[PDB]
């Protein structure tokens, strides 16, 4: 859950692999895209509530 | 000076201030999604 600890962006999981004197991690990340603009409001008034 | 020298840093203070300002603007405006 700690941000950017492993993989740039939201993290899903990872795969390990060996190397002659080290390790290699493959991080799978989720990246949102195709953003659209909208207009919001914090609260809705109904029946005086 | 008798054989000792001082080298200048690669990044000047101005670009450091620019990075700090960019980070601050990004975190105020977009929250955390920009990270
Ligand atoms: C949200 O709506 C605004 C209003 O149209 C859009 O704002 C544009 O933003 C770009 C980049 O800053 C400017 O170059 C345009 O002039 C803006 N249009 C205006 C002020 O009419 C914006 O694209 C929409 N979407 C988002 C994600 O902000």
UniProtKB/Swiss-Prot annotation, chain A:
Domain of life the protein comes from: Viruses
Glycosylation sites: 37
Functional description taken from the UniProt entry: Subunit of the fusion protein that is processed upon entry into the host cell. Mediates fusion of the virion and cellular membranes by functioning as a class I viral fusion protein. Contains a viral fusion peptide that is unmasked after S2 cleavage. This cleavage can occur at the cell membrane by host TMPRSS2 or during endocytosis by host CSTL. In either case, this triggers an extensive and irreversible conformational change that leads to fusion of the viral envelope with the cellular cytoplasmic membrane, releasing viral genomic RNA into the host cell cytoplasm.
Protein name as catalogued: Spike protein S2'
Gene: S
Residues of the full protein shown: 1038 to 1086 of 1273
